[PDB]
Design a protein around this ligand. Structure first.
Ligand code: ADP
Ligand code: ADP
Ligand code: BEF
Ligand code: BEF
Ligand code: MG
Ligand code: MG
Ligand code: ZN
Ligand code: ZN
Lengths: 337, 343, 248, 366, 373, 237
DNA sequence: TTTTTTTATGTACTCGTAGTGTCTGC
DNA sequence: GCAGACACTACGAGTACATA
């Protein structure tokens, strides 16, 4: 069936959206807002299997029409998926233009057509802007589908003409119960990983299943080593990687939990590791702690913003910046205007 | 297969020909003049008809026409001069070469010319079959420190007198670009057949046309010589490599140097270089490089470098290449910047 | 691919479809912003299978009677499908069975049925494009006009193959210019009577039209300089062409 | 298979007559004066923010230029040419998806056939949408045709922003800046549309949809269509309030007063409670900025509060009494900078926490 | 007669005699002197910002060269060749829209055809417009012909950014830079255009159009046509002001004076008046910044005020005399920060209100008093 | 004579190489270019390259003097130094500019036509404003801003050059000969402000110019922004 | 002695190849 | 006839360059 396994919390929204697509008053451009890995793409695939099914019933595809076997076979001339090319993290304007020009003709099968964009935010500005005038005035029986982490990042014009359908991550008790049903280790680290993932159970599942957990353990051990001594340089050995911004996010999360502990907040994101946050609060002044926080976040967004930048250099310069900030009598950054 | 130097390839050329010849190595001009010497030696000998073939993938072997059929009006033997691709050939071409050798006539000579090949390309079927009788020879341009002796030796071979100042200005202006060096030597010889050139007009007949690969750039910046670094950057003009290569280079050595300074309190710098075998001709040039610095100095360097790193790639700056002039010069006379930049 | 409804059957020699397509293929759009402009319009009438091709500035419509009752239906077929269909025509003895659908065009030739996807658009009303008054009408020998236009066009402007008719009483004057100024003038004796008039227009298009129809005696109809010219053969009215003027 | 496919409001209610357009009084008056008086021009570019109507104004102008009545200020709407332009069949209105058809090849192709007379209409209108994504060569190719086109061809440009165009093209067209539509115009148009569409609506819900659209008919109308899916058949205040994530409660000013008094624990507790309830963060900081503005304004001139501000005056005037004038502006600047950096933060809640901690860093004594 | 055709002011009023030009001296004089002295150089490039006359100057010079009589600096408007180039599509003027001719496949054809002699007049004038759009191979192809063209070929190259050209092309041909026009010249041209158009006009509206034209005459003429459309066929200060969005309404000097006098109530009243007027706030802020800048410039040197701004010069001088430079800098920085933060303000009116309030309360000589302690 | 060889296609270069390797003895053929780096190394190595140097200012000046004396045109020396300086070294450039000078000067290349050219050849502007910032010179700042406005160079680049000059000045303050090769023609005036001005004032000026650049694009006009930067710099000391 | 390491999108040019009009002594 | 010449025109690829 769906590539990503069905998630139980996605059932209600499905029905609601199916309702909007049964009366014929679907918006033909249903920009899904869901946290990455939470199951936005699964919902898109279920919906598109419904729509491109020329013989559906109720609220679920027949699964018997040979259109459905084309769907499960992964090949269909009325199903245009736009994904980044293998090895490149952006989908070009060439692919979007090809899809739009191919969508010009009728439906091959005597039914509807669906263009599904794998991730809206990854669109190049030229590519995204070339998708206008095709989802604003689409051909008859044309449906679009887009998924994103945060709609505000998109181009303003493109977001303007798309029905922004939100998905809420499940309540933390339900999410931790599901994780414990699927994932095995302690509930404390489970909750910590869930919080690190902005509340998305799928990303916490991905962090635990992958090697990211052992990487986080090594990084937190290195932090425990570095904080009393001030040898932040060693942390480079755990930061420089293909997935560097995620670990920088972990570091910033630790810093913010330290600042909250200084303010005495009861609930913290890194609750699984009280020793680290306690040490961070003890050894670092809040005035310099917020400076460390700001530079960490700035460098994170620079790593994740500009494509193909030398992560090693920026990470090491960050580490040297903390080295300077540890030294007393230094000017601290102020968020500029 | 012998893997010798052309100073001996001349000796094997003077003696009986050892079947196919393969001269390799990236050469500014030495490859072409060695080819010319081979051509004249062959012309003195039997083989005279030099058929030029460009070895390349997706290009069929028209050489088989010469290989299968013998010349009919003037046989006079003949020589197939093969031009290898800059990355080396593929397996199909490597085996078709063996097929050609199977088609080799007694009056046929095989000359294969190219750059250094990969081990699989080096140990292909054709080379393995030709390892019994053919020869292999390689050469490379002289280094910066090896230039003056080579230039003086060439001048003495050409029967023209040079001077220390003339050699200095030549090795500065023509550093590793032997074609330009040879043309300048001929120009100085023809301009004045007096045979005495000390420093009268050698600069007048010599321009600034030389290659400059990035590895030497830090070699100046580590001394912090303002005028020397500025002149090196001005020399880099008109052969301007895109900034990313230079940036990768200096970020490599500065990360290495900052790691070295962090570990300097630990195991000494020599045994630390034992890990950092970057072959900077001794690993001791870096040893005298690390003598003149400070931790705050490294901070001031890394701040500017990392600010440039986002200055060229985040927003595609156009002055960023000239920014390489800015970053290298400011470090020369900056013991430690009292913040005021802290980028 | 499955079968389709709204599927009227045709029985016609391949020569009929070949004549039709060859009559209205040179005036079919090629990579133009108007997406419906590509391909040919096949429209079914009780009288014929009319076909319409246009670039927006060459409107060629052919009408070969079919002898069968045809429910009114209008279709647009893209350029690729039309070219392939014309390639699959030969022989002239086998009956071609053209099967129309909502989104596809199928065709049975001999023992093979081939299909083509169908452009989604609403093609313009060609009848309104055709001029509403043929007040100035002239007839002239087809081959004579073709030869004269070729002669004039050999000095015409290269990028804009543009000549100018000057129609006077029983006389056609062709005048052509180009960069590196060269003037080509040619006078033809025609069967014309009416108001003196001049009109500039592309000559490649008119040469193409005359090549397509190639009758004994052509006649064209026209009113004013801005007005488009409607050219057909004087024998029948099965094929009509519309050429839009140069200048203004 | 609905009526064509525009069961969505965004396409169904695009105006068909200059009388049916909302706002844009200056540009509509200018176009009507030009059409009726006879002063016509070959190149108009309409520049304005998204969802204001530059495409619609351009198409309506194209209708008005080619109506069989003559060059009429108000298009017929019933005559054959207007019907054809509505269907898109009209062979002289050459619309261009210039964002999609960017290559200079196609610009040259469409410029070669400019000399031809129009097929049926008076003028051969070259409507170009999203002009700003033309490649530089295409922009410069359009130059000599934009400047002195033949007598019968007229260009229309419809770009999101004007400053990306080269200054050469920007100096050869009439720059009509479409003024963004204020809240009242949006509310009136939305109420009229809903009354035509026969679905019950509440005035305050329409006020929310107007104030959240930031001046755009397309944005507000899409938001209403989203609410119709949520609020069954009706744009109800509760449903749109929950969907839009508005700050119905008073926790906004509560965490304002917690933040200005350097109560980190209280601010964190309020943030945790709001995140648990399901708040939206951008609206939170917008409300912060508004409340701070009201506090500062009554700090300067009292009796400036209105409605809800005039009701919570008991707290607002006390805050204006206790907070110095200098620190109010600093809090406002910090909050607005945080709102600026909300997109550049992996988690929205984490971004708001960062902003609040930056604000509390002004007085981080305890 | 008045010839009521209503066809685009820009195209109707393109200069046709050598004297109708707006007042470019350093290029018109040079061209006239060259044509008088017989020094007709075979290739020269006109540069300058958009809509100054370079494409027009090229047409005038081709008119002058190919006149029926001897080469005359001031072309006649009666001979067949001048009439033809006047009407366009002239036989010997080959106007090449180089932006449409960039492939070398066409420049090669051009250099192929260049040899054949012209039929009428003396020269054949290759007016290659938008030169900078030619592809590199086309430039290199043109190089040898430009160095030594035949006797009867002149190359009229015109472009907007000559720095894009390969430097050798700049070397081959002369270089005439056309300076952007002054406000007085452009206003005089607008007066002439409207007077000949028999359209009533108001001096303030013409000054507004000249100011907003950014020193390029076609911008002013397009704006004049747009204002003629905006009004009921007449150019009025009210129509131009409302169409441009300028703040001539209630000026802006009242707002800045209320700022320096620290009267919050006056600022509020002016803000409410502007809001009822429905003005855009960013334009108001830009006006305030410009006022501050002019005040500072006058404080450095009283001759900085423009003649177009001679309406409020006394109060301008007084504000320059009173406010110390540091307060002016503080106001400028505060208002500039406000303008930067306007897109991120909760509302443009509210953001401008707080920017005014911040620049008021931080005024050192009269700050907003601390409430209690 | 195959002029401008750098435009030959790759296969064209291969044909040229096959002709050069076995050239007929009875023929030769020259060759010319402007960007020699584009030729293949084989043909460059084969050909006996001569490199032709850019003309010096004195060479161009004397040649132009001779040319003007040859036909009939009177000339004054300062105009000729100006023409040579603006020629940037190319003799053909000097001849094109002397044609323009003759045209504007009505058959006489006097100092006034080349003064009209002076608006184009006037280059040294960024250093004078830096020198005039550290004090109140009166009309110097107004004249320089008028020149910048009438010249319309990139204001962002102008202020970046200002910042670079000021930063190297601060570098010289902490090192008596920090660059040395910076502005060899102004090694007798720039040094005074390189050492006399206190480093604290230099840091404050750097702060002012950095703040001005950071806020420059948001000014009503970039000319107004640079004016305000200059006024702020002149406001303090 | 083998050593790190930016893109998307567009525009030209020149070399094969492939397909097709047209027509010439075969 | 006529197929093969012979021309001619269009398309892909490999390369060089530009600009954001
Ligand atoms: N001025 C207006 N009057 C009426 N409806 C408008 C107006 N502006 C926008 N709309 C609505 O917005 C929808 C899209 O308008 P459109 O003209 O495409 O905006 P854009 O300028 O961004 O392309 C229209 O279908 C119409 O419902
Ligand atoms: N010097 C001038 N005198 C009069 N009108 C001018 C002048 N320069 C520009 N214009 C106006 O601009 C219109 C187009 O000018 P144009 O010469 O095309 O400028 P460009 O140099 O950018 O091609 C003209 O029709 C004319 O009205
Ligand atoms: F800006 Be609109 F959505 F075309
Ligand atoms: F409008 Be101009 F030729 F820049
Ligand atoms: Mg639009
Ligand atoms: Mg022009
Ligand atoms: Zn099914
Ligand atoms: Zn005349």
């Amino acid at each position: 069936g769906p590539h990503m396994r069905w998630y139980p919390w996605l059932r209600p929204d499905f029905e609601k959206l199916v309702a909007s697509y049964q009366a014929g008053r679907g918006h033909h451009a249903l920009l899904i807002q869901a946290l990455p890995g939470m199951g936005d793409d699964a919902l898109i695939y279920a919906l598109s299997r419904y729509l491109l099914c020329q013989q559906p019933q109720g609220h679920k595809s027949c699964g018997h029409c040979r259109g459905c076997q084309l769907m499960q076979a992964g090949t269909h001339p009325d199903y245009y998926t736009l994904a980044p090319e293998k090895g490149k993290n952006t989908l070009g304007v060439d692919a979007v233009r090809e899809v739009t020009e191919k969508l010009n003709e009728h439906a091959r099968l005597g039914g509807a057509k669906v263009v599904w964009v794998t991730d809206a935010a990854l669109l190049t500005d030229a590519a995204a802007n070339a998708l206008l005038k095709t989802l604003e005035e689409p051909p008859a029986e044309t449906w679009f589908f887009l998924a994103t982490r945060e709609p505000e990042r998109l181009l303003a014009t493109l977001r303007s003409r798309c029905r922004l359908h939100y998905l809420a991550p499940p309540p933390e008790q339900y999410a931790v119960t599901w994780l414990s049903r699927e994932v095995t280790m302690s509930q404390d680290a489970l909750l910590a990983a869930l919080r690190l993932s902005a509340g998305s159970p799928g990303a916490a599942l991905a962090l635990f299943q992958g090697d990211n957990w052992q990487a986080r353990e090594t990084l937190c051990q290195a932090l425990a080593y570095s904080v009393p001594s001030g040898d932040w340089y060693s942390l480079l050995a755990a930061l420089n990687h293909e997935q560097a911004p995620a670990r920088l996010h972990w570091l910033a999360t630790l810093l913010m939990d330290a600042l909250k502990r200084h303010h005495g907040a009861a609930q913290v994101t890194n609750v699984d590791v009280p020793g680290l946050v306690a040490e961070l609060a003890n050894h670092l002044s809040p005035s310099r702690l917020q400076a460390i926080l700001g530079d960490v976040c700035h460098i994170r967004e620079q790593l994740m913003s500009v494509t193909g930048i030398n992560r090693e250099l920026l990470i090491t310069d960050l580490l040297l910046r903390i080295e300077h900030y540890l030294q007393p009598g230094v000017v601290l950054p102020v968020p500029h205007l | 297969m012998i893997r010798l130097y052309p100073e001996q390839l001349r000796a094997q050329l003077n003696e009986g020909l050892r079947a196919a010849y393969l001269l390799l190595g990236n050469d500014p001009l030495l490859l072409q003049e060695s080819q010319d010497a081979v051509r004249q030696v062959a012309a003195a000998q039997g083989f005279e008809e030099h058929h030029t073939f460009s070895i390349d993938p997706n290009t069929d072997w028209n050489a088989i026409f010469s290989l299968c059929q013998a010349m009919s009006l003037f046989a006079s033997r003949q020589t197939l001069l093969l031009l290898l691709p800059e990355n080396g050939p593929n397996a199909a071409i490597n085996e078709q070469l063996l097929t050609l050798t199977g088609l080799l006539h007694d009056d046929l000579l095989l000359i294969v010319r190219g750059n250094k090949l990969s081990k699989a390309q080096e140990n292909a079927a054709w080379f393995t079959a030709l390892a019994n009788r053919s020869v292999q020879v390689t050469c490379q341009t002289p280094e910066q420190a090896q230039l003056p002796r080579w230039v003086a030796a060439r001048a003495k071979q050409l029967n023209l007198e040079l001077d220390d100042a003339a050699n200095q200005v030549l090795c500065y202006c023509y550093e590793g670009n032997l074609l330009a060096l040879a043309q300048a030597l001929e120009r100085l010889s023809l301009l004045w057949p007096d045979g005495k050139l000390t420093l009268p007009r050698v600069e007048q007949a010599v321009n600034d046309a030389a290659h400059f690969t990035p590895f030497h750039w830090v070699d100046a910046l580590l001394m912090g010589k303002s005028k020397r670094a500025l002149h090196i950057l001005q020399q880099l003009r008109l052969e301007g490599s895109e900034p990313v290569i230079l940036l990768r280079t200096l970020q490599r050595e500065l990360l290495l140097l900052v790691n070295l300074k962090r570990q300097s309190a630990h195991t000494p710098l020599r045994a630390l270089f034992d890990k950092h075998r970057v072959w900077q001709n001794r690993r001791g040039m870096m040893g005298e490089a690390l003598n003149r610095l400070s931790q705050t100095q490294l901070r001031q360097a890394v701040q500017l470098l990392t600010r440039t790193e986002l200055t060229l790639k985040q927003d595609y700056g156009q002055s960023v290449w000239a920014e390489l002039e800015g970053l290298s010069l400011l470090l020369c006379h900056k013991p430690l910047a009292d913040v005021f930049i802290d980028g | 691919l499955d079968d389709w409804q709204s599927e009227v059957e045709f029985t016609l020699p391949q020569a009929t479809m070949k004549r039709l397509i060859e009559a209205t293929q040179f005036s079919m759009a090629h990579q133009d912003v108007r997406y419906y402009l590509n391909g040919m319009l096949f429209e079914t009438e009780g009288e014929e299978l009319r076909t319409v091709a246009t670039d927006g500035h060459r409107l060629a419509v052919c009408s070969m009677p079919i002898g069968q009752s045809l429910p009114s239906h209008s279709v647009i077929v893209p350029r690729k499908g039309v070219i392939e269909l014309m390639r699959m025509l030969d022989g002239g003895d086998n009956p071609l069975r053209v099967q129309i659908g909502s989104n596809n065009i199928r065709a049975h030739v001999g023992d093979f049925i081939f299909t083509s996807k169908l452009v989604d658009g609403r093609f313009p009303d060609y009848r309104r494009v055709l001029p509403k008054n043929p007040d100035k009408h002239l007839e002239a020998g087809c081959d004579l006009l073709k030869q004269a236009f070729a002669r004039a066009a050999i000095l015409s402007n290269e990028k804009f193959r543009g000549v100018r008719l000057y129609v006077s009483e029983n006389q056609l004057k062709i005048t052509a210019n180009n960069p590196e100024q060269e003037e080509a003038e040619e006078i033809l004796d025609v069967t014309y009577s009416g108001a003196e008039m001049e009109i500039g227009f592309n000559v490649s298009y008119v040469l193409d039209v005359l090549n397509a129809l190639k009758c004994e005696n052509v006649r064209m109809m026209l009113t004013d300089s801005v007005s488009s010219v409607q050219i057909e053969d004087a024998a029948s009215q099965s094929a009509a062409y519309v050429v839009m003027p140069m200048r203004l | 298979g609905p009526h064509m496919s525009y069961q969505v409001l965004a396409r169904k209610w695009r105006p068909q007559t200059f009388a049916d357009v909302v706002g844009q009084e200056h540009v509509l008056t200018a176009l009507a004066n030009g059409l009726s008086l006879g002063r016509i021009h070959h190149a108009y570019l309409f520049s304005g923010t998204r969802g204001v109507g530059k495409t619609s104004i351009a198409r309506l102008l194209a209708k008005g230029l080619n109506c069989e009545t003559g060059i009429t200020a108000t298009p017929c709407g019933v005559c054959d040419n207007c019907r054809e332009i509505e269907q898109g069949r009209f062979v002289d209105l050459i619309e261009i998806d210039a964002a999609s058809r960017t290559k200079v090849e196609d610009t040259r192709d469409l410029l070669d056939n400019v000399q031809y007379a129009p097929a049926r209409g008076r003028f051969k209108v070259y409507l170009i949408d999203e002009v700003h994504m033309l490649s530089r060569h295409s922009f410069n190719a359009l130059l000599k045709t934009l400047e002195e086109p033949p007598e019968h061809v007229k260009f229309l440009l419809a770009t999101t922003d004007p400053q990306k165009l080269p200054v050469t093209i920007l100096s050869r067209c009439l720059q009509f800046h479409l003024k963004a539509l204020d809240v009242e115009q949006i509310r009136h148009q939305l109420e009229h549309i809903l009354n035509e569409e026969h679905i019950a609506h509440e005035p305050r819900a329409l006020q929310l949809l107007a104030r959240a659209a930031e001046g755009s008919l397309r944005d507000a109308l899409s938001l209403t269509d989203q609410a119709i899916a949520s609020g069954d058949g009706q744009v109800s205040t509760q449903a749109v309030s929950a969907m839009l994530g508005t700050l119905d409660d008073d926790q906004a000013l509560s965490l304002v007063e917690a933040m200005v008094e350097a109560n980190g624990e209280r601010v964190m507790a309020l943030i945790n409670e709001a995140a648990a309830r399901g708040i939206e963060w951008e609206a939170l900081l917008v409300e912060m900025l508004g409340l701070l503005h009201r506090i500062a304004m009554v700090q300067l001139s009292p009796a400036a509060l209105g409605n809800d501000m005039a009701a919570i005056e008991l707290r607002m005037r006390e805050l204006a009494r206790t907070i110095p004038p200098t620190d109010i502006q600093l809090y406002y600047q910090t909050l607005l900078i945080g709102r600026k950096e909300l997109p550049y933060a992996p988690d929205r809640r984490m971004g708001v926490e960062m902003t609040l901690l930056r604000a509390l860093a002004f007085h981080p004594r305890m």
